[PDB]
Write a protein that binds this DNA or RNA. Structure first.
Lengths: 95, 162, 80, 83, 106, 82, 383, 73
RNA sequence: GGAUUUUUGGAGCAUCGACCUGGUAUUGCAGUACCUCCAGGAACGGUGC
C-alpha cells in the first residue's frame, strides 16, 4: 500500500540502486554490463526492484572477433533490459 | 478426381509404425501428383497406395521427406527432377509398377542419399541382369527389393557393361 | 513500481526481442503477461549465425528473453 | 494448485518413462514415484552418460532442476487430463 | 450460347472484309442454303452483331495495329491519365445534361 | 489473458535452450511454462567441423514428452490439429 | 487462330475496359489518404497491365502484312467460311450459357462494397510497402537514419533536430568529409528516399523521371552545374576548384581525375550519382520533409499522454405444447407438420384447400381429419 | 516447499552426480527441503583412478543432478 | 511474483551408433533401453574434454 510504497522509495533512495535513482535524478547515462559481454551506455528512464531497466538513447558496444577483434557498436533509441542479464551497473562513466 | 490441397488437408496425418510422421492417401485414384507443398515440410513419409498416377513427377521441394510409397500404381515413366526436390530421400517403394525398360531406372541413380529401393512386381525385373544394372546405376542403394547388396554382385555389375 | 506492468500494456507494436542464446525475434507483440511471456505474430527470428526465418506466430518465455528494442514512437511517460 | 503437465507426470508413475538430464544423460526406467517439482525416482534405469554408454543403475533419483525433458509412454496419450 | 457467339463473331469477321455494302461473304451464303437468322435486323442479337462488325472495322483502322504502332497509349502513362480525366469530365458533363433534362421535364 | 491456451492441441515447435527443436501436439501447459507434446520429435543440429561438410539435423521421435519450462525458450506454431 | 481479327479486338476491348475502370476510379471522390494511395496503386497496376497488353498487341503484326492479301480478297472467301461453319458444327449437347465474355473483364476491373480492391489487386496491401510511422506517404521515417548517422559519427552530440538540419542542406558544405565512409551511409539513406519517390507517387512515371535525372546528371552535373562569380568552377568528384572552363576541360581528361585518385570519376561515380539522386529527392519531397520535421517537433514538444494519444491513432415450451413431433400429411404432397394443433389449424387453411382442390373434393367439414387421398376419394364418392 | 521423498535413501550407500562432471559416493544421513544432502563416509572420485575420502560432506540441491542407490533401498 | 527443483541466468583421447565379408545355433506367438557367438577390412558419423 502507501507504507510499502514509502519503504520502496526509501530503499530506492538509500539502498544499492540509489545510483540507479541517480539515473532518475539528473538524467545521466549509466554503463550496464550484460551477460553476452555487451556494454550499454545510456540513461535509465524506469527501474524496479528486480533491476529491470528502461533505457533511452542507449549505445551498445561489444567485441566481435572476425586477427584482432573490432569494437562494433550500435545505437538504440528506446530499449528495455531484464535484470537477470545485468552484471555491473556504473553510474558515472569515463567516456 | 484430381489431387489438390483440400485432399491433403483432409487426409489423416499421424505417426507410422517406423516412428515417423506419415500422411495416408490410400484410395484416392489421383492421375497426377501436384500441390503437395501445403504440408510445410512436416512429414517424412507419403503414401500413395491405390492411385492411377501414370508418371511420378511434379513433386515440390521437400527436405523433411525420407520415404516414398508409390505401391499399387500405374507408373510407366519416371521423372528426372526428383533428386533436386527430395535431398534427404532414403526409402523408395515403387512396387507394382509398369516399368519395362532398363532406362526408366536411370534418373533413380540421381538420389545420392537413397539406400532402400523396392522394384518388385514389375516387368523390369523380368529381364536379365536387372539387379546388376540397378547396382551398377545407383551404388548408394544398400537394400534392393528387400535384399542386401553383395560384393560379388558389385563385381558382376562393374564387370558388365564395360 | 514493477517493470512488467509497463510491458504488459503493449499491443500491436513492432518490437525486437533479443533472447539469451543469440536469438533475435522482430515482430508485432500481441500479448504480454505478468511473467513477461511475449506472444507475437508475424515474427522474423534470427538465431546465432543463422538465416532469418519467418514465423506466423511465436511465444517466447520471460526468463529466456535478454533484452528488448522498442520503436522510437513510443512514449515511456504514459506507460509508467 | 497442480499443473496439468505435473498431473500428467504424476499419472505416468508406474510405467516405463525416459527422463533427460541437463548434461545430456538420458535415463529410461520404471518411474516409481513422482513429485510436484519434477523429482523423478526411477527403477531399472539405463544411463547413457551423454556418450552412448548405457549402464544399468538401480533406484535412481533425478531432481527437477536438471530434468530438461521427460518422455512419457504413449499409453497415457488418452488421459482425461489432456482431453 | 458459345456456338451462337462464335457464329456471330465469324459473320462479323467475314462481313467486314467486303468491298461493298451488299457484296459481302454472307450475302451469297444466304443464297447458298446456309441458314443465318442473325443477318436480319428483326432479331435483337443482330444489334450486337452490327456492333461486332463495328469492332471488326475497329480492327481495320491504320492506327489499330495493322500498319502503325501506337506510342501514346502504350508508352505514356500521363497521356492515359489525361484521357481518363477527359472521359471523367465527359461523363460528368453527360450527367449534368441528364440532370438538366430531368429538371426541364419536371 | 489466455493466449497460451489458444494454441493448445496444435502441432507446435518449441525451441530448447541447448538449440534443439521439439515439434509435437502441445496438449497441456501450466504456469511454469511446461509442455505436454503428444507424438513429439526432437531435432538437434550437428556441427559440420570441416570446410566442405554440410550442417545436418538429427531427428528422433519420442512420443509423449513432458518438457519443463526451464529448458524451453520459444514456441512457434507449425501445423493444424490432425 | 484469328490473331489479327479476334485477338486485336480482344486487346482493344481490354484496353477500353481498363480505361473505363481508370476513369471510374478518377471520377469517384476520395476521403482518406490510405484509400487514395491504394486506389493509385491499383490504377498503376491497371496501367501496367494495359501497357503490357498494348505491347503484346503491338507485336502481332508480322504475319498480318502477309495475310492481308488473302484477307482483302473478295473473290476468295466463303468456301473457307463454309469449311469454318462445318468445323463449328460440333455437338450442341453442351447446354450451358456463358454470359461472361465481356462481363468477366467488367467484374474483374471492379471492387466490392466490403473491400475497395480490384480482382487482380485483391492481394495488394498498403502495410507491405509502407511503415506505420510513414502514414502512407504523410511522413518519412528518419529514426534509423539518425541512429546510423550517430553510429557513424561516433558522438552523441547530434539530436534529431540537428540531423534534420544537416539533411536539409542541398548545396552547402557537408557535415563530414566526402572521402570518408559516411557517403556509404548517404547512399543507403538515399536508397529508401528514392524508394519514397516510388512510394509517394505510384501514378507517375518512375522510368521517365529516372531518365531525366540521369540526363541532368550527365549533361549538366558532370559539366560544371555550379558556376560562380577556384570559385568559378567546382567539381563534385575531385572536390577542387578551377580557374577557367578551358582548365576544367583540360583537367577533366587528366590522370588523377580519371583513375589516379581515391575520389576520381571511376570509383566515386556511383557515390556522386547517389548524392545527386538524394539531392533531387530532397528537392522533390521538401514538403514531406517539412511535414516530418513538424511532426517530430510536435512529438517532442508534447507530453506523455498527448504522445500516447498521437501514437494510438426453449425445450420445455416445445415439449409441453406438442412441438417437434413429426406428422405426415399425404394430401399436400406428403408434407411435414411439427404439431397436432398446428396440423389441425393447417387443415382448415389455404394450402390444404389448394391441395384438395386438385383432386376435385370440395372444402367441407367432412374432410377435416382426412389425410390419405384414397380415403378422401372414397369419402367424396360416398356422398 | 515440499521436501523430497528421500526416506528410502536414508542411511544407505548411494552415489550422487554433481555438476561439472563431479562424482561422490557415501551414506546419506539426512535430507533438506532444498534437496541438500549430507553424506557420511563420502569418497569423491575425479577423472583419475584415485578417490579422495572426505569424511562428512554437505552437498547443495542446485548442484546435484542424479543419485543412484548402490544398495537395495 | 526477485535466494538452491521451473520465471529475474553458470554465463589428440574416452564412448556409442553405423558399412561390408566368412563359418556357426535358434523355426520360436507378441506389445520392446540392446540382443547368438568368433574372426577380418574400413579411406563413415554423433557428444564432452
Amino acid at each position: 500500500p502507501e507504507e510499502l510504497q514509502k519503504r520502496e522509495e526509501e530503499e530506492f533512495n538509500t539502498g544499492p540502486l540509489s545510483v540507479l535513482t541517480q539515473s532518475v535524478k539528473n538524467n545521466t547515462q549509466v554503463l550496464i554490463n550484460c551477460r553476452n559481454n555487451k556494454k550499454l551506455l545510456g540513461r535509465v528512464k524506469a527501474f524496479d526492484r528486480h533491476c529491470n531497466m528502461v533505457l533511452e538513447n542507449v549505445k551498445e558496444m561489444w567485441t566481435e572477433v572476425p586477427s584482432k577483434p573490432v569494437n562494433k557498436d550500435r545505437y538504440i533509441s528506446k530499449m528495455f533490459l531484464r535484470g537477470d542479464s545485468v552484471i555491473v551497473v556504473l553510474r558515472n562513466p569515463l567516456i | 478426381v484430381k489431387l489438390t490441397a483440400e485432399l491433403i488437408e483432409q487426409a489423416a496425418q499421424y505417426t507410422n509404425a517406423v516412428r515417423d510422421r506419415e500422411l495416408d492417401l490410400r484410395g484416392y485414384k489421383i492421375p497426377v501428383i501436384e500441390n503437395l507443398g501445403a504440408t510445410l515440410d512436416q512429414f517424412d513419409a507419403i503414401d500413395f497406395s491405390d492411385n492411377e498416377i501414370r508418371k511420378l513427377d511434379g513433386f515440390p521441394l521437400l527436405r523433411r521427406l525420407k520415404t516414398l510409397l508409390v505401391n499399387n500404381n500405374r507408373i510407366c515413366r519416371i521423372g528426372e527432377g526428383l533428386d533436386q526436390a527430395l535431398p534427404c530421400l532414403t526409402e523408395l517403394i515403387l512396387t507394382n509398377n509398369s516399368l519395362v525398360e532398363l532406362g526408366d531406372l536411370d534418373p533413380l541413380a540421381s538420389l545420392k542419399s537413397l539406400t532402400y529401393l523396392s522394384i518388385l512386381r514389375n516387368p523390369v525385373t523380368n529381364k536379365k541382369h536387372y539387379r546388376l544394372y540397378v547396382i551398377y546405376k545407383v551404388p548408394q542403394v544398400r537394400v534392393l527389393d528387400f535384399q542386401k547388396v553383395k560384393l560379388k554382385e558389385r563385381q558382376e555389375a562393374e564387370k558388365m557393361f564395360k | 513500481m514493477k517493470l512488467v506492468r509497463f510491458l504488459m500494456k503493449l499491443s500491436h507494436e513492432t518490437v525486437t526481442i533479443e533472447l539469451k542464446n543469440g536469438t533475435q525475434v522482430h515482430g508485432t507483440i500481441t500479448g504480454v503477461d505478468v511473467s513477461m511471456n511475449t506472444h507475437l505474430k508475424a515474427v522474423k527470428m534470427t538465431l546465432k549465425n543463422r538465416e532469418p526465418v519467418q514465423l506466423e506466430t511465436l511465444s517466447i518465455r520471460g526468463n529466456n528473453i535478454r533484452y528488448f528494442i522498442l520503436p522510437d514512437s513510443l512514449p515511456l511517460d504514459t506507460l509508467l | 494448485s497442480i499443473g496439468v503437465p505435473i498431473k500428467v507426470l504424476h499419472e505416468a508413475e508406474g510405467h516405463i518413462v525416459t527422463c533427460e538430464t541437463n548434461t545430456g544423460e538420458v535415463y529410461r526406467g520404471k518411474l516409481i514415484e513422482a513429485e510436484d517439482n519434477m523429482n523423478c525416482q526411477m527403477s531399472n534405469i539405463t544411463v547413457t552418460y551423454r556418450d552412448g554408454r548405457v549402464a544399468q543403475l538401480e533406484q535412481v533419483y533425478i531432481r527437477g532442476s536438471k530434468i530438461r525433458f521427460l518422455i512419457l509412454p504413449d499409453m497415457l496419450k488418452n488421459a482425461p487430463m489432456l482431453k | 450460347s458459345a456456338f451462337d457467339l462464335d457464329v456471330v463473331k465469324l459473320t462479323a469477321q467475314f462481313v467486314a472484309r467486303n468491298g461493298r455494302q451488299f457484296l459481302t461473304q454472307l450475302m451469297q451464303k444466304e443464297q447458298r442454303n446456309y441458314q443465318f437468322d442473325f443477318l436480319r435486323p428483326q432479331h435483337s442479337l443482330f444489334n450486337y452483331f452490327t456492333k461486332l462488325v463495328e469492332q471488326y472495322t475497329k480492327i481495320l483502322i491504320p492506327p489499330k495495329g495493322l500498319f502503325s504502332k501506337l506510342k501514346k497509349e502504350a508508352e505514356n502513362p500521363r497521356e492515359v491519365l489525361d484521357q481518363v480525366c477527359y472521359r471523367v469530365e465527359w461523363a460528368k458533363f453527360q450527367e449534368r445534361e441528364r440532370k438538366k433534362e430531368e429538371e426541364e421535364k419536371e | 489473458s489466455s493466449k497460451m491456451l489458444q494454441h493448445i492441441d496444435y502441432r507446435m515447435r518449441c525451441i530448447l535452450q541447448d538449440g534443439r527443436i521439439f515439434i509435437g501436439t502441445f496438449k497441456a501447459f501450466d504456469k511454469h511454462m511446461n509442455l505436454i507434446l503428444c507424438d513429439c520429435d526432437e531435432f538437434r543440429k550437428i556441427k559440420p567441423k570441416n570446410s566442405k561438410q554440410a550442417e545436418r539435423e538429427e531427428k528422433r521421435v519420442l512420443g509423449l514428452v513432458l518438457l519443463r519450462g526451464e529448458n524451453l525458450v520459444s514456441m512457434t506454431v507449425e501445423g493444424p490439429p490432425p | 487462330m484469328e490473331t489479327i481479327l479476334e485477338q486485336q479486338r480482344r486487346y482493344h476491348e481490354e484496353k477500353e475496359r481498363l480505361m473505363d475502370v481508370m476513369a471510374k476510379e478518377m471520377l469517384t471522390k476520395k476521403s482518406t489518404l490510405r484509400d487514395q494511395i491504394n486506389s493509385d496503386h491499383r490504377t498503376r497496376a491497371m496501367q501496367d497491365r494495359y501497357m503490357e497488353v498494348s505491347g503484346n498487341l503491338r507485336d502481332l503484326y508480322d504475319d498480318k502484312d502477309g495475310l492481308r492479301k488473302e484477307e482483302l480478297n473478295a473473290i476468295s472467301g466463303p468456301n473457307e467460311f463454309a469449311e469454318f461453319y462445318n468445323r463449328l458444327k460440333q455437338i450442341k449437347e453442351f447446354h450451358r450459357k456463358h454470359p461472361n465474355e465481356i462481363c468477366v473483364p467488367m467484374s474483374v476491373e471492379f471492387e466490392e462494397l466490403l473491400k475497395a480492391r480490384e480482382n487482380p489487386s485483391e492481394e495488394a496491401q498498403n502495410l507491405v510497402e509502407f511503415t506505420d510511422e510513414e502514414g502512407y506517404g504523410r511522413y518519412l521515417d528518419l529514426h534509423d537514419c539518425y541512429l546510423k548517422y550517430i553510429n557513424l559519427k561516433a558522438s552523441e552530440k547530434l539530436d534529431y533536430i540537428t540531423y534534420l538540419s544537416i539533411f536539409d542542406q542541398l548545396f552547402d558544405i557537408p557535415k563530414e568529409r566526402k572521402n570518408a565512409e559516411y557517403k556509404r551511409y548517404l547512399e543507403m539513406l538515399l536508397e529508401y528516399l528514392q524508394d519514397y519517390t516510388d512510394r509517394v507517387k505510384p501514378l507517375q512515371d518512375q522510368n521517365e523521371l529516372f531518365g531525366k535525372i540521369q540526363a541532368e546528371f550527365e549533361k549538366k552535373w558532370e559539366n560544371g552545374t555550379f558556376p560562380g562569380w577556384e570559385e568559378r568552377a567546382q567539381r563534385l568528384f575531385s572536390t577542387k576548384g578551377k580557374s577557367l572552363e578551358s582548365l576544367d576541360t583540360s583537367l577533366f581528361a587528366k590522370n588523377p581525375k580519371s583513375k589516379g585518385t581515391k575520389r576520381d570519376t571511376e570509383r566515386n561515380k556511383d557515390i556522386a550519382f547517389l548524392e545527386a539522386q538524394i539531392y533531387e529527392y530532397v528537392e522533390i519531397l521538401g514538403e514531406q520533409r517539412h511535414l516530418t520535421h513538424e511532426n517530430v517537433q510536435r512529438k517532442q514538444a508534447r507530453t506523455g499522454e498527448e504522445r500516447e494519444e498521437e501514437e494510438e491513432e426453449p425445450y420445455w415450451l416445445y415439449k409441453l405444447h406438442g412441438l417437434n413431433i413429426n406428422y405426415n400429411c399425404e394430401i399436400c404432397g406428403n408434407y411435414t407438420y411439427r404439431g397436432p394443433k398446428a396440423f389441425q389449424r393447417h387443415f382448415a387453411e389455404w394450402r390444404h384447400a389448394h391441395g384438395m382442390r386438385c383432386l376435385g373434393i370440395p372444402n367441407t367439414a367432412h374432410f377435416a381429419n382426412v389425410t390419405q387421398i384414397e380415403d378422401a376419394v372414397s369419402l367424396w364418392a360416398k356422398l | 516447499a515440499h521436501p523430497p521423498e528421500l526416506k528410502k535413501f536414508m542411511d544407505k550407500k548411494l552415489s550422487l552426480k554433481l555438476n561439472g562432471g563431479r562424482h561422490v559416493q557415501g551414506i546419506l544421513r539426512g535430507f533438506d527441503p532444498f534437496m541438500n544432502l549430507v553424506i557420511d563416509e563420502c569418497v569423491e572420485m575425479a577423472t583419475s583412478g584415485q578417490q579422495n575420502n572426505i569424511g562428512m560432506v554437505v552437498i547443495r540441491g542446485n548442484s546435484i543432478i542424479m543419485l543412484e542407490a548402490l544398495e537395495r533401498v
